[PDB]
Amino acid sequence: AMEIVYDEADLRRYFQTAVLLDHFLDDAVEVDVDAICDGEMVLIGGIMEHIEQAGVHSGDSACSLPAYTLSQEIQDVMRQQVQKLAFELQVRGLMNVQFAVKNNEVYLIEVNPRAARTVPFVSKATGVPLAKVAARVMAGKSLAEQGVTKEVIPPYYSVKEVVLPFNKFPGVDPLLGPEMRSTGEVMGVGRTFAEAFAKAQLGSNSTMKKHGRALLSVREGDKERVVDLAAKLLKQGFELDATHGTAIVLGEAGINPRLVNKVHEGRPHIQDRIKNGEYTYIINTTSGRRAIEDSRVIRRSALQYKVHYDTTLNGGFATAMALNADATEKVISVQEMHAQIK
Amino acid sequence: AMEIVYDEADLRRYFQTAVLLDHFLDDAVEVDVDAICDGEMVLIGGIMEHIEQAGVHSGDSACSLPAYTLSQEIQDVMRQQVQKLAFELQVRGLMNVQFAVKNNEVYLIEVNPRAARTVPFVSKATGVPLAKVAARVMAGKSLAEQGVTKEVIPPYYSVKEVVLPFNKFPGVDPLLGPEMRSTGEVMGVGRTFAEAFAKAQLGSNSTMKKHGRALLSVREGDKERVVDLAAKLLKQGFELDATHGTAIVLGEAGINPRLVNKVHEGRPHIQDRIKNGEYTYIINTTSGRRAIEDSRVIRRSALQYKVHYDTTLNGGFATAMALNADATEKVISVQEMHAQIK
Ligand SMILES: Nc1ncnc2c1ncn2[C@@H]1O[C@H](COP(=O)(O)OP(=O)(O)O)[C@@H](O)[C@H]1O
Ligand SMILES: Nc1ncnc2c1ncn2[C@@H]1O[C@H](COP(=O)(O)OP(=O)(O)O)[C@@H](O)[C@H]1O
Ligand SMILES: NCCC[C@H](N)C(=O)O
Ligand SMILES: NCCC[C@H](N)C(=O)O
Ligand SMILES: [Cl-]
Ligand SMILES: [Cl-]
Ligand SMILES: [Cl-]
Ligand SMILES: [Cl-]
Ligand SMILES: [Cl-]
Ligand SMILES: [Cl-]
Ligand SMILES: [K+]
Ligand SMILES: [K+]
Ligand SMILES: [K+]
Ligand SMILES: [K+]
Ligand SMILES: [Mn+2]
Ligand SMILES: [Mn+2]
């Protein structure tokens, strides 16, 4: 059990119901790196960039290989960083390192000196059977001896998306957090990140549509960025709805959504609309044990009514991007994929 | 002093701060009628339809001669009612009667057996010097004897608008009510009601513009009709702004105004927007002691910053209409006006 606390008040509050204390890196990109070390050298297996920010368990985040927003310069550091750790730790076989990029700064989140649940994905995107190689390494067959020394950079985009069990347990708030709840994953392969994401999304059993009405209800820290997402949705032909606070923000930017009522506000309220199959998309971000408990109804309703909803703005942008793509336009086989690797 | 209470809880409330008790005829048209009685006949001097509904002092309402919404059917009833009263009370010279029209029903508000303040306006509008006629009657000369027996209905519209002294007392909430506060009045002469109104409004020192951003903030009972007003402003080239409840109603109408924060809501709020010159027009209607007190800021700011504002929906519609006119287009003299009368 983990939780994020925001203020002194919040602290106590936890303490009641409720030990390491760690500063939470707000508005940070989460990254996964799987690598192999034989003592001599380090082979970077894969650099995965999470769609959802740090604070949403790696295990529940979608991720891209290669990174789709991060700088080469920045990867390069993580890369250097891993190597440093691999030797220091005296890693012999697989390892996994988790970072967080904040303001062009790399923070270390944790190191797993073992095989991580990402390996099969990486193995598949890159064509390198990371598990076998690392096994060989463990048995006494260097990377050099194996002929696997260069880091592989795929020609295409591989996106990993998760599948959550919320629908089996309705009483639960289908919301993301620092604790992993997903049961499985899918993979999307595309020429563009948008394509890959689009395939991954569909694969995960998404009910996202390419038209209709979107509901925008984001948190403070998101009010600023939501503008561009709304514009993307609008460009896509979506019609918009927004809860007061968010409507305020959009409007000041030149975007007037239809104002919708919260539950305690009037009628109809979002629930009604959700229930009536009024929306095809919901973007809902929150921040705070209270704000969360208060918005629970949006999420439960959406899940219950099969409306695709995102609980992260990052996730929403990705959803938006994927709108430009067509998951059924092109298929490729694993063999072909790997045949493409130089 | 007069007040309008809305519920039992309101009654006590008043009672505390605080007797005739009169049912208040909501959503009613107020009308003024000026006439002369010589004991033999009754001469109708003028039937004036107010713009502001009953509840807004006749002395502070703009009015039209002739009526601009009242059925002939209904005016005739009032004419008959004025004759009945003239004779009964034994009027000898001028009189004035105030009615309220609710649901095609004529209600009597009051009778003033003397010369009323509308007398000069009616004389100007009609070319008949009612004070001179009534004076001769008082002195012995009948209406028949003077050759003034038929009611005059002029070929043009005459609109009277008032000027309020609120600008001299900034602490005062510049809102209309059952008690008179105006100091003066002007008259507008037009081929249409919109033209007369335009001239009257301009004559009243109104800062109304034919373009810009308007702010809508209306009460419950007006939410229905506000849509049509919002559209009308739309047709004109105005951009809209609105507070929560209003925005809600407009949204349901397909009109998406730019949301605006009530003062307790956040920012920016109306005050800021008004203070920063955002608006060129304001329509703000309120009902209830409490609601009024709360909205005080809007009105006080609108006045301080010189934005044209209406405190009645009837007023806003009139304003709406006038936009279709040009008060400088044509001018006519009283001599000319009077020669047009048959
Ligand atoms: N300091 C931190 N700031 C922001 N997010 C963090 C921080 N520490 C952990 N997280 C988030 O919590 C998740 C779980 O943290 P982690 O230490 O890796 O736990 P686990 O052992 O369950 O894998 C991460 O994948 C990340 O999204
Ligand atoms: N019962 C009522 N329903 C609606 N409006 C009314 C009612 N009684 C009076 N009014 C409003 O109050 C105003 C003033 O009332 P009135 O009886 O004419 O007093 P005054 O002596 O000031 O002329 C009217 O012009 C009208 O707007
Ligand atoms: N990557 C986890 C799934 C994301 C889900 N649509 C959500 O935004 O909550
Ligand atoms: N005839 C009354 C003046 C109108 C003013 N603009 C108001 O509506 O309050
Ligand atoms: Cl359950
Ligand atoms: Cl679709
Ligand atoms: Cl926030
Ligand atoms: Cl004052
Ligand atoms: Cl203008
Ligand atoms: Cl009301
Ligand atoms: K994450
Ligand atoms: K761990
Ligand atoms: K009136
Ligand atoms: K009176
Ligand atoms: Mn972890
Ligand atoms: Mn009166």
Coordinates of N, CA and C in Angstrom, one line a residue, chain A residues 108-288:
Chain A
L108 N 16.1 9.0 -10.1 CA 16.1 7.6 -10.0 C 15.0 7.1 -9.1
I109 N 14.1 6.3 -9.6 CA 12.9 5.8 -8.8 C 13.1 4.4 -8.2
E110 N 13.8 3.6 -8.9 CA 14.2 2.2 -8.4 C 14.9 1.4 -9.5
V111 N 15.6 0.4 -8.9 CA 16.4 -0.5 -9.7 C 16.0 -1.9 -9.3
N112 N 15.7 -2.7 -10.3 CA 15.3 -4.1 -10.1 C 16.3 -4.9 -10.9
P113 N 17.2 -5.5 -10.1 CA 18.3 -6.3 -10.6 C 17.9 -7.7 -11.0
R114 N 16.8 -7.7 -11.7 CA 16.2 -9.0 -12.1 C 15.4 -8.8 -13.4
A115 N 14.7 -9.9 -13.8 CA 13.8 -9.8 -15.0 C 12.5 -9.1 -14.6
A116 N 12.2 -8.1 -15.4 CA 11.0 -7.3 -15.2 C 9.9 -7.6 -16.2
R117 N 8.7 -7.4 -15.8 CA 7.6 -7.7 -16.6 C 7.6 -7.0 -18.0
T118 N 8.5 -6.2 -18.2 CA 8.6 -5.5 -19.5 C 9.4 -6.3 -20.6
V119 N 10.3 -7.1 -20.2 CA 11.1 -7.9 -21.0 C 10.4 -8.5 -22.3
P120 N 9.3 -9.2 -22.1 CA 8.7 -9.8 -23.2 C 8.3 -8.8 -24.3
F121 N 7.9 -7.6 -23.8 CA 7.5 -6.5 -24.7 C 8.7 -6.0 -25.5
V122 N 9.7 -5.7 -24.7 CA 10.9 -5.2 -25.3 C 11.4 -6.2 -26.3
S123 N 11.5 -7.5 -25.9 CA 11.9 -8.6 -26.7 C 11.2 -8.7 -28.0
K124 N 10.0 -8.4 -28.0 CA 9.1 -8.4 -29.1 C 9.3 -7.2 -30.0
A125 N 9.4 -6.0 -29.4 CA 9.6 -4.9 -30.2 C 10.9 -4.9 -30.9
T126 N 12.0 -5.2 -30.2 CA 13.3 -5.2 -30.7 C 13.8 -6.4 -31.4
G127 N 13.1 -7.6 -31.2 CA 13.6 -8.8 -31.9 C 14.6 -9.6 -31.1
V128 N 15.1 -9.0 -30.0 CA 16.1 -9.6 -29.2 C 15.5 -10.3 -28.0
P129 N 15.7 -11.6 -27.9 CA 15.2 -12.4 -26.8 C 16.0 -12.2 -25.5
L130 N 15.8 -11.0 -25.0 CA 16.4 -10.6 -23.8 C 16.6 -11.6 -22.7
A131 N 15.6 -12.4 -22.6 CA 15.6 -13.4 -21.5 C 16.6 -14.5 -21.7
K132 N 16.7 -15.0 -23.0 CA 17.6 -16.0 -23.4 C 19.1 -15.6 -23.3
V133 N 19.3 -14.4 -23.8 CA 20.6 -13.8 -23.7 C 21.1 -13.6 -22.3
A134 N 20.2 -13.1 -21.5 CA 20.5 -12.9 -20.1 C 20.7 -14.2 -19.4
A135 N 20.0 -15.2 -19.8 CA 20.1 -16.5 -19.2 C 21.5 -17.0 -19.6
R136 N 21.9 -16.9 -20.8 CA 23.2 -17.3 -21.3 C 24.3 -16.6 -20.6
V137 N 24.1 -15.3 -20.3 CA 25.0 -14.5 -19.5 C 25.2 -15.1 -18.1
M138 N 24.1 -15.5 -17.5 CA 24.1 -16.0 -16.1 C 24.8 -17.3 -16.0
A139 N 24.8 -18.1 -17.1 CA 25.5 -19.3 -17.2 C 27.0 -19.3 -17.6
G140 N 27.5 -18.1 -17.9 CA 28.9 -17.9 -18.2 C 29.2 -17.6 -19.7
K141 N 28.3 -17.0 -20.5 CA 28.5 -16.7 -21.9 C 28.3 -15.2 -22.2
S142 N 29.4 -14.4 -22.0 CA 29.4 -13.0 -22.2 C 28.5 -12.5 -23.4
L143 N 28.2 -11.2 -23.3 CA 27.4 -10.6 -24.4 C 28.2 -10.6 -25.7
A144 N 29.5 -10.3 -25.5 CA 30.4 -10.3 -26.6 C 30.4 -11.6 -27.3
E145 N 30.6 -12.7 -26.5 CA 30.6 -14.1 -26.9 C 29.3 -14.4 -27.6
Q146 N 28.2 -13.8 -27.2 CA 26.9 -14.0 -27.8 C 26.7 -13.2 -29.1
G147 N 27.4 -12.1 -29.2 CA 27.2 -11.4 -30.4 C 26.1 -10.5 -30.2
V148 N 25.9 -10.1 -29.0 CA 24.8 -9.1 -28.8 C 25.4 -8.0 -28.0
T149 N 25.8 -7.0 -28.7 CA 26.5 -5.9 -28.0 C 25.9 -4.5 -28.3
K150 N 25.2 -4.4 -29.4 CA 24.7 -3.1 -29.8 C 23.3 -2.9 -29.5
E151 N 23.0 -1.7 -29.0 CA 21.6 -1.4 -28.6 C 20.7 -1.3 -29.9
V152 N 19.6 -2.0 -29.9 CA 18.6 -2.0 -31.0 C 17.6 -1.0 -31.0
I153 N 17.5 -0.2 -32.1 CA 16.5 0.8 -32.3 C 15.6 0.5 -33.4
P154 N 14.4 0.1 -33.1 CA 13.4 -0.3 -34.1 C 13.0 0.8 -35.1
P155 N 12.7 0.4 -36.3 CA 12.3 1.3 -37.3 C 10.9 1.8 -37.0
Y156 N 10.1 0.9 -36.4 CA 8.7 1.2 -36.1 C 8.5 1.6 -34.6
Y157 N 7.2 2.0 -34.3 CA 6.8 2.3 -33.0 C 6.1 1.1 -32.4
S158 N 6.4 0.7 -31.2 CA 5.8 -0.3 -30.4 C 5.2 0.3 -29.2
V159 N 3.9 0.2 -29.0 CA 3.2 0.7 -27.9 C 2.5 -0.4 -27.1
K160 N 2.7 -0.3 -25.8 CA 2.2 -1.3 -24.9 C 1.0 -0.6 -24.2
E161 N -0.1 -1.3 -24.1 CA -1.3 -0.8 -23.4 C -1.8 -1.9 -22.4
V162 N -2.3 -1.5 -21.2 CA -2.8 -2.4 -20.3 C -4.3 -2.6 -20.3
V163 N -4.7 -3.7 -19.6 CA -6.1 -4.2 -19.4 C -6.4 -4.3 -17.9
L164 N -7.4 -3.6 -17.4 CA -7.7 -3.5 -16.0 C -8.9 -4.2 -15.7
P165 N -8.9 -4.9 -14.5 CA -10.0 -5.7 -14.0 C -11.2 -5.0 -13.4
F166 N -11.3 -3.7 -13.5 CA -12.3 -2.9 -12.8 C -13.7 -3.4 -13.1
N167 N -13.9 -3.8 -14.4 CA -15.3 -4.3 -14.6 C -15.7 -5.6 -13.9
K168 N -14.8 -6.3 -13.3 CA -15.1 -7.5 -12.5 C -15.6 -7.2 -11.1
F169 N -15.2 -5.9 -10.7 CA -15.4 -5.4 -9.3 C -15.9 -3.9 -9.4
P170 N -17.2 -3.8 -9.7 CA -17.9 -2.6 -9.9 C -17.8 -1.6 -8.7
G171 N -17.8 -2.1 -7.5 CA -17.7 -1.2 -6.3 C -16.4 -0.4 -6.3
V172 N -15.5 -0.8 -7.1 CA -14.2 -0.1 -7.2 C -14.2 1.1 -8.1
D173 N -13.4 2.1 -7.7 CA -13.2 3.3 -8.5 C -12.1 3.0 -9.5
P174 N -12.5 3.0 -10.7 CA -11.6 2.6 -11.8 C -10.7 3.7 -12.1
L175 N -9.8 3.9 -11.2 CA -8.9 5.0 -11.3 C -7.4 4.6 -11.1
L176 N -6.5 5.2 -11.9 CA -5.1 4.9 -11.8 C -4.3 5.5 -10.6
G177 N -3.2 4.8 -10.2 CA -2.5 5.3 -9.1 C -1.2 4.5 -9.0
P178 N -0.5 4.8 -7.9 CA 0.8 4.2 -7.6 C 0.8 2.7 -7.3
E179 N -0.4 2.2 -7.4 CA -0.5 0.8 -7.1 C -1.0 0.1 -8.4
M180 N -0.4 -1.0 -8.8 CA -0.7 -1.8 -10.0 C -1.9 -2.6 -9.8
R181 N -2.9 -2.5 -10.8 CA -4.1 -3.3 -10.7 C -4.4 -4.1 -12.0
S182 N -3.6 -3.8 -13.0 CA -3.8 -4.4 -14.3 C -3.6 -6.0 -14.3
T183 N -4.3 -6.7 -15.2 CA -4.1 -8.1 -15.3 C -3.2 -8.5 -16.5
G184 N -3.3 -7.7 -17.5 CA -2.6 -8.0 -18.8 C -2.3 -6.8 -19.6
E185 N -1.7 -7.1 -20.8 CA -1.3 -6.0 -21.7 C -1.5 -6.5 -23.2
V186 N -1.4 -5.5 -24.0 CA -1.5 -5.6 -25.5 C -0.3 -4.8 -26.1
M187 N -0.1 -5.0 -27.3 CA 1.0 -4.3 -28.0 C 0.5 -3.8 -29.3
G188 N 0.8 -2.6 -29.7 CA 0.4 -1.9 -30.9 C 1.7 -1.6 -31.7
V189 N 1.7 -1.9 -33.0 CA 2.9 -1.6 -33.8 C 2.5 -0.6 -34.9
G190 N 3.3 0.5 -35.0 CA 2.9 1.4 -36.1 C 4.1 2.2 -36.6
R191 N 3.9 2.8 -37.8 CA 4.9 3.6 -38.4 C 5.1 4.9 -37.6
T192 N 4.0 5.3 -37.0 CA 4.0 6.5 -36.2 C 3.5 6.1 -34.8
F193 N 3.9 6.9 -33.8 CA 3.5 6.6 -32.5 C 2.0 6.6 -32.4
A194 N 1.4 7.5 -33.1 CA 0.0 7.6 -33.1 C -0.7 6.3 -33.6
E195 N 0.0 5.7 -34.5 CA -0.6 4.5 -35.1 C -0.4 3.3 -34.1
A196 N 0.7 3.3 -33.5 CA 1.0 2.2 -32.6 C 0.0 2.3 -31.4
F197 N -0.1 3.5 -30.9 CA -1.0 3.8 -29.8 C -2.4 3.4 -30.2
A198 N -2.8 3.7 -31.4 CA -4.1 3.5 -31.9 C -4.3 2.0 -31.9
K199 N -3.3 1.2 -32.3 CA -3.5 -0.2 -32.3 C -3.6 -0.8 -30.9
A200 N -2.7 -0.3 -30.1 CA -2.6 -0.7 -28.7 C -4.0 -0.4 -28.0
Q201 N -4.5 0.8 -28.3 CA -5.7 1.1 -27.7 C -6.9 0.3 -28.0
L202 N -7.1 0.0 -29.3 CA -8.1 -0.8 -29.8 C -8.0 -2.2 -29.2
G203 N -6.7 -2.7 -29.2 CA -6.4 -4.0 -28.7 C -6.8 -4.3 -27.3
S204 N -6.7 -3.3 -26.4 CA -7.0 -3.3 -25.0 C -8.5 -3.3 -24.8
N205 N -9.3 -3.4 -25.8 CA -10.7 -3.4 -25.8 C -11.4 -2.1 -25.6
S206 N -10.8 -1.0 -26.1 CA -11.3 0.4 -25.9 C -12.6 0.6 -26.7
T207 N -13.5 1.4 -26.1 CA -14.7 1.9 -26.7 C -14.6 3.3 -27.3
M208 N -13.4 3.8 -27.4 CA -13.2 5.1 -28.0 C -13.8 5.2 -29.4
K209 N -14.4 6.3 -29.8 CA -15.0 6.5 -31.1 C -14.3 7.7 -31.8
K210 N -14.5 7.9 -33.1 CA -13.8 8.9 -33.8 C -14.6 10.2 -34.0
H211 N -15.8 10.2 -33.3 CA -16.8 11.3 -33.4 C -17.7 11.3 -32.1
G212 N -18.5 12.3 -32.1 CA -19.5 12.5 -31.0 C -19.2 13.7 -30.0
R213 N -19.5 13.5 -28.8 CA -19.3 14.5 -27.8 C -18.4 14.0 -26.7
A214 N -17.4 14.9 -26.3 CA -16.4 14.6 -25.2 C -16.7 15.4 -24.0
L215 N -16.4 14.8 -22.9 CA -16.6 15.5 -21.7 C -15.2 15.8 -21.0
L216 N -15.0 17.1 -20.8 CA -13.8 17.5 -20.2 C -13.9 18.0 -18.8
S217 N -13.2 17.4 -17.8 CA -13.2 17.7 -16.4 C -11.9 17.4 -15.8
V218 N -11.0 18.4 -15.9 CA -9.7 18.2 -15.4 C -9.3 19.1 -14.3
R219 N -8.3 18.6 -13.6 CA -7.8 19.3 -12.4 C -7.0 20.5 -12.7
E220 N -6.8 21.3 -11.7 CA -6.0 22.6 -11.7 C -4.8 22.6 -12.5
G221 N -3.9 21.8 -12.1 CA -2.6 21.6 -12.8 C -2.8 21.3 -14.2
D222 N -4.0 20.8 -14.6 CA -4.2 20.4 -16.0 C -4.9 21.4 -16.8
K223 N -5.6 22.3 -16.2 CA -6.5 23.4 -16.8 C -5.7 24.1 -17.9
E224 N -4.5 24.3 -17.6 CA -3.7 25.0 -18.6 C -3.6 24.2 -19.9
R225 N -3.1 23.0 -19.8 CA -2.8 22.1 -21.0 C -4.1 21.5 -21.7
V226 N -5.2 21.4 -21.0 CA -6.4 20.9 -21.5 C -6.8 21.7 -22.7
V227 N -6.4 22.9 -22.8 CA -6.8 23.7 -23.9 C -6.4 23.1 -25.3
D228 N -5.2 22.7 -25.4 CA -4.7 22.1 -26.6 C -5.4 20.7 -26.8
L229 N -5.7 20.0 -25.8 CA -6.4 18.8 -26.0 C -7.8 19.0 -26.6
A230 N -8.5 20.0 -26.1 CA -9.8 20.4 -26.5 C -9.8 20.8 -27.9
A231 N -8.7 21.5 -28.2 CA -8.6 21.9 -29.6 C -8.4 20.7 -30.5
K232 N -7.6 19.8 -30.1 CA -7.4 18.6 -30.9 C -8.8 17.9 -31.1
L233 N -9.5 17.7 -30.0 CA -10.8 17.1 -30.1 C -11.8 17.8 -31.0
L234 N -11.7 19.1 -30.9 CA -12.6 20.0 -31.7 C -12.1 19.8 -33.2
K235 N -10.8 19.8 -33.4 CA -10.4 19.6 -34.8 C -10.9 18.3 -35.4
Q236 N -11.0 17.3 -34.5 CA -11.5 16.0 -34.9 C -13.0 15.9 -35.1
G237 N -13.7 17.0 -34.8 CA -15.2 17.1 -35.0 C -16.0 16.6 -33.8
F238 N -15.3 16.7 -32.7 CA -16.0 16.3 -31.5 C -16.7 17.6 -31.0
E239 N -17.8 17.5 -30.3 CA -18.5 18.6 -29.7 C -18.1 18.6 -28.2
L240 N -18.0 19.7 -27.6 CA -17.5 19.7 -26.2 C -18.5 20.1 -25.1
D241 N -18.3 19.4 -24.0 CA -18.9 19.6 -22.7 C -17.8 19.8 -21.7
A242 N -18.1 20.6 -20.7 CA -17.2 20.9 -19.7 C -17.8 21.3 -18.4
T243 N -17.2 20.9 -17.3 CA -17.7 21.2 -16.0 C -17.2 22.6 -15.8
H244 N -17.8 23.4 -14.9 CA -17.6 24.8 -14.7 C -16.1 25.2 -14.7
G245 N -15.3 24.7 -13.8 CA -13.9 25.1 -13.7 C -13.1 25.0 -15.0
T246 N -13.4 23.9 -15.7 CA -12.7 23.6 -16.9 C -13.3 24.5 -18.0
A247 N -14.6 24.7 -17.9 CA -15.2 25.6 -18.9 C -14.7 27.0 -18.9
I248 N -14.4 27.4 -17.7 CA -13.9 28.7 -17.5 C -12.6 28.8 -18.3
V249 N -11.7 28.0 -18.0 CA -10.4 27.9 -18.6 C -10.4 27.8 -20.1
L250 N -11.3 27.0 -20.6 CA -11.4 26.9 -22.1 C -11.8 28.1 -22.7
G251 N -12.8 28.7 -22.1 CA -13.4 29.9 -22.7 C -12.4 31.0 -22.7
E252 N -11.6 31.1 -21.6 CA -10.7 32.2 -21.7 C -9.7 32.0 -22.8
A253 N -9.7 30.8 -23.3 CA -8.8 30.6 -24.4 C -9.5 30.7 -25.7
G254 N -10.8 31.0 -25.8 CA -11.4 31.1 -27.1 C -12.2 29.8 -27.4
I255 N -12.4 29.0 -26.4 CA -13.2 27.7 -26.6 C -14.3 27.6 -25.7
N256 N -15.5 27.7 -26.2 CA -16.7 27.6 -25.4 C -17.3 26.3 -25.6
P257 N -17.2 25.5 -24.6 CA -17.8 24.1 -24.5 C -19.2 24.3 -24.0
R258 N -20.0 23.2 -24.0 CA -21.3 23.3 -23.5 C -21.1 23.1 -22.0
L259 N -21.7 24.0 -21.1 CA -21.5 23.8 -19.7 C -22.4 22.8 -19.2
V260 N -21.8 21.8 -18.5 CA -22.6 20.7 -17.9 C -22.5 20.9 -16.3
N261 N -23.5 20.3 -15.6 CA -23.6 20.4 -14.2 C -23.0 19.2 -13.5
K262 N -22.3 19.4 -12.4 CA -21.8 18.3 -11.6 C -23.0 17.6 -10.9
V263 N -22.7 16.6 -10.2 CA -23.9 16.0 -9.6 C -24.7 16.8 -8.7
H264 N -24.0 17.4 -7.7 CA -24.7 18.2 -6.7 C -25.1 19.6 -7.3
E265 N -24.9 19.8 -8.6 CA -25.2 21.0 -9.2 C -26.5 21.2 -9.8
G266 N -27.1 20.1 -10.3 CA -28.3 20.3 -11.0 C -28.6 19.3 -12.0
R267 N -29.5 19.6 -12.9 CA -29.9 18.7 -13.8 C -30.1 19.2 -15.2
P268 N -29.7 18.4 -16.2 CA -29.1 17.1 -15.8 C -27.7 17.4 -15.4
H269 N -27.1 16.4 -14.8 CA -25.7 16.5 -14.4 C -25.0 15.4 -15.3
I270 N -23.7 15.3 -15.2 CA -23.0 14.4 -16.0 C -23.4 12.9 -16.0
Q271 N -24.1 12.5 -14.9 CA -24.4 11.1 -14.7 C -25.5 10.8 -15.6
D272 N -26.4 11.8 -15.6 CA -27.5 11.6 -16.4 C -27.0 11.5 -17.8
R273 N -26.2 12.5 -18.2 CA -25.7 12.4 -19.6 C -24.9 11.2 -19.9
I274 N -24.1 10.8 -19.0 CA -23.3 9.6 -19.2 C -24.2 8.5 -19.4
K275 N -25.1 8.3 -18.5 CA -26.1 7.3 -18.5 C -26.9 7.2 -19.9
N276 N -27.2 8.4 -20.3 CA -28.0 8.5 -21.6 C -27.2 8.2 -22.8
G277 N -25.9 8.0 -22.6 CA -25.1 7.7 -23.8 C -24.9 8.9 -24.6
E278 N -24.7 10.0 -23.8 CA -24.5 11.3 -24.3 C -23.0 11.6 -24.8
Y279 N -22.1 10.9 -24.2 CA -20.7 11.1 -24.6 C -20.1 9.9 -25.2
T280 N -19.0 10.1 -26.0 CA -18.3 9.0 -26.7 C -16.9 9.0 -26.1
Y281 N -16.6 10.1 -25.3 CA -15.3 10.2 -24.7 C -15.3 11.1 -23.4
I282 N -14.5 10.7 -22.5 CA -14.4 11.4 -21.2 C -13.0 11.6 -20.8
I283 N -12.6 12.8 -20.5 CA -11.3 13.1 -20.0 C -11.5 13.6 -18.6
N284 N -11.0 12.9 -17.6 CA -11.3 13.3 -16.3 C -10.1 13.2 -15.4
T285 N -9.5 14.3 -15.0 CA -8.4 14.3 -14.2 C -8.7 14.9 -12.9
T286 N -8.1 14.3 -11.8 CA -8.3 14.7 -10.4 C -7.0 14.8 -9.7
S287 N -7.0 15.3 -8.5 CA -5.8 15.5 -7.6 C -6.3 15.7 -6.2
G288 N -6.2 14.7 -5.4 CA -6.6 14.9 -4.0 C -7.6 13.8 -3.5

